[PDB]
Design a protein around this ligand. Structure first.
Ligand SMILES: COc1ccc(O)c(C(=O)c2ccc(C(=O)N[C@@H]3CCCNC[C@H]3NC(=O)c3ccncc3)cc2)c1F
Lengths: 341, 20
């Protein structure tokens, strides 16, 4: 019946998502409505900046992407997926898209600012999380993938760099640049080397199960302080991943090792998340026995770690990046390519 | 230790995605 209650929530959620999926919001703001303060991160085609909405005084995080660069690297479809998916989803552990627009030069997405910083920063500094602390975060991702996959979405870039910590210590998943709505298999070689499932590396055509593999990698990295497969160059990482050989730190609880053995299963018919029982194989595993899944969804559970921040606009949980002036050309670049954005 | 090998590795910073 708990299982039925989740089944009901998902059907409702799917109806909401499809309305926005089929009729996406367009052009709901303008650049000169925002004051640009500081860069919080970068990516291949641009950056995310803290901004202040001038008429409300609210702070947001604005992704700016350069259209020409996107087109040069043939990443049009993926950037169009990012915005289309992000505007349609609604979940407590997904970052909220507030506005989007474009001009002659750039694409813009204005999201909720998540001031606690990236999980990556905290994990590197502290070293590793204790199993209860990792479990807390893992549970939020389990539910988030349960949500996303019911919508036929695959996320494909789970890593601590894309998990922001909010003021209450919960996760907000960001950076949907490889998210894709797909009913069957797909083939793009994409993602972050350390987190790539074997079937992606092997050019096999793959599905949602790549997200469950990636969750395995994440939980390991959270609890070990390093990922299961690492080396100085990508090619050596790929070799380790396809070999199907994982060593666990001596301090891992036997329940944690057993989970990871099922998530880091090279064999897709054996991988937790890809079985007839679906996500329930994961939620019912012994490592999660103390997890109250609904309390997590509702956010009544007490976060093991709450980031400090002196007020809105505070960026102290973020690294410093070099700033660059945003130039907007007088001539429209790549109009047809981005017409739906 | 594996921790020490990770820390001396070239991949302890932010990791970029690859694409097609
Ligand atoms: C195929 O390649 C793609 C596809 C889609 C894309 O959007 C991009 C990007 O160019 C791109 C640009 C900027 C970023 C970025 O700056 N992201 C930051 C830093 C990287 C790690 N993820 C965290 C992210 N931070 C936030 O999204 C954020 C959100 C809300 N509050 C604070 C931070 C990421 C990707 C891209 F390169």
């Amino acid at each position: 019946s708990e299982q039925e209650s989740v089944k009901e929530f998902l059907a409702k959620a799917k109806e909401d998502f499809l309305k926005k999926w089929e009729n996406p919001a367009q052009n709901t703001a303008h650049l000169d409505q925002f004051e640009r303060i500081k860069t919080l991160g970068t990516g291949s085609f641009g950056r995310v900046m803290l901004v202040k909405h001038m008429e409300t005084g609210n702070h947001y995080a604005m992704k700016i992407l350069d259209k020409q660069k996107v087109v040069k690297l043939k990443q049009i479809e993926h950037t169009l997926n990012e915005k289309r998916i992000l505007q349609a989803v609604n979940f407590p552990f997904l970052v909220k898209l507030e506005f989007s627009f474009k001009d002659n030069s750039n694409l813009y997405m204005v999201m909720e600012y998540v001031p606690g910083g990236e999980m990556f920063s905290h994990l590197r500094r502290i070293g590793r999380f204790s199993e209860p602390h990792a479990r807390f975060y893992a549970a939020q991702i389990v539910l988030t993938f349960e949500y996303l996959h019911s919508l036929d979405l695959i996320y494909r870039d789970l890593k601590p760099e894309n998990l922001l910590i909010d003021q209450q210590g919960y996760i907000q998943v960001t950076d949907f640049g490889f998210a894709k709505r797909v009913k069957g298999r797909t083939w793009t070689l994409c993602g972050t080397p350390e987190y790539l499932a074997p079937e992606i590396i092997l050019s096999k055509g793959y599905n949602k199960a790549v997200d469950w593999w990636a969750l395995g990698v994440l939980i390991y990295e959270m609890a070990a302080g390093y990922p299961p497969f690492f080396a100085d160059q990508p090619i050596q990482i790929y070799e380790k991943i396809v070999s199907g050989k994982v060593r666990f730190p001596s301090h891992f609880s036997s329940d944690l090792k057993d989970l990871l053995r099922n998530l880091l299963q090279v064999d897709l018919t054996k991988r937790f998340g890809n079985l007839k029982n679906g996500v329930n194989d994961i939620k019912n595993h012994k490592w999660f026995a103390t997890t109250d899944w609904i309390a997590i969804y509702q956010r009544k559970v007490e976060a093991p770690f709450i980031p400090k921040f002196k007020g809105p606009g505070d960026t102290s949980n973020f690294d410093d990046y070099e700033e660059e002036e945003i130039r907007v050309s007088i001539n429209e670049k790549c109009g047809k390519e981005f017409s739906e954005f | 230790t594996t921790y020490a090998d990770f820390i001396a590795s070239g991949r302890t910073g932010r990791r970029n995605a690859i694409h097609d």
